[PDB]
Design a protein around this ligand. Structure first.
Ligand SMILES: [Cl-]
Ligand SMILES: [Cl-]
Lengths: 149, 8, 149, 8
């Protein structure tokens, strides 16, 4: 559970926003890509795993689950690649609420940025610092340090 | 152009 | 000291590798860019500060220190922007040694990757996981969790 | 090509 992440893909302005959620904290990383391909997904996971100790990734759809390029990055980075079936239906609801919250923040910042990728990084920043009380950024560090100790 | 990422 | 980072710029294969070092742990993030500009620097810092609690950044040279774009990103993200003068001459030597270590790792992985940007992320992953026995990934989480508590 | 990022 300190090591479990969920991928999530959402669309805006004709482009794709790929998000990884650390399940136990609500903390996120995200990027803007022109389209979701196994190569883009695999590179994003390699970046994520070099920065946090990623043990398991629930993929966002069957295409990235199937993709041999995604599986080769997970092999390289020591990640267990799993499906994203919401056996717990609460997962579905949490992800959709998170997407709407991100789109809301992106909309509140959109006119401060020329490029969508700046607005998305502004939205990552505000989401991870938001105190709900601790922030998601605080929670992920606490959860992982507790587990290292 | 008056944006954080393009100040012009 | 949990909030202090140092930027560092090194070159390889005709391109630029921008690195942020978390000073107290040795942990790093890095990206490949075609040239170091104020806009590329500012975007890299906005990404970094959405992911870790960045209080201070020592810029890597006087052009990024000067750059009004870099200053605007530091303002947006709540980062105190500082110069990079090594009043402690040990700073120069630690950085030069880290660049030579990264380039050595990049050369050991170089033929597993078509693009330099993959070889660089593979070197970030190996640097941050290497046990010296704690890794730099372990040390940054512990330092910051201690400070949160 | 037998690269992680280009398996072809
Ligand atoms: Cl797509
Ligand atoms: Cl340059």
């Amino acid at each position: 559970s300190p090591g479990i992440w969920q991928l999530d893909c959402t669309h805006l302005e004709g482009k794709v926003i790929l998000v990884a959620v650390h399940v136990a904290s609500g903390y996120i990383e995200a990027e803007v890509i022109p389209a979701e391909t196994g190569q883009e997904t695999a590179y994003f996971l390699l970046k994520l795993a070099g920065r946090w100790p990623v043990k398991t990734v629930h993929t966002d759809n069957g295409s990235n689950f199937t993709s041999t390029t995604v599986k080769a990055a997970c092999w390289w980075a020591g990640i267990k690649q799993e499906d994203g079936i919401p056996y717990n239906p609460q997962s579905q609801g949490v992800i959709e609420s998170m997407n709407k919250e991100l789109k809301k923040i992106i909309g509140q910042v959109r006119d401060q940025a020329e490029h969508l990728k700046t607005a998305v990084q502004m939205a990552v920043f505000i989401h991870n610092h938001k105190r709900k009380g601790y922030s998601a950024g605080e929670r992920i560090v606490d959860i992982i340090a507790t587990d290292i100790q | 152009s008056h944006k954080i990422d393009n100040l012009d």
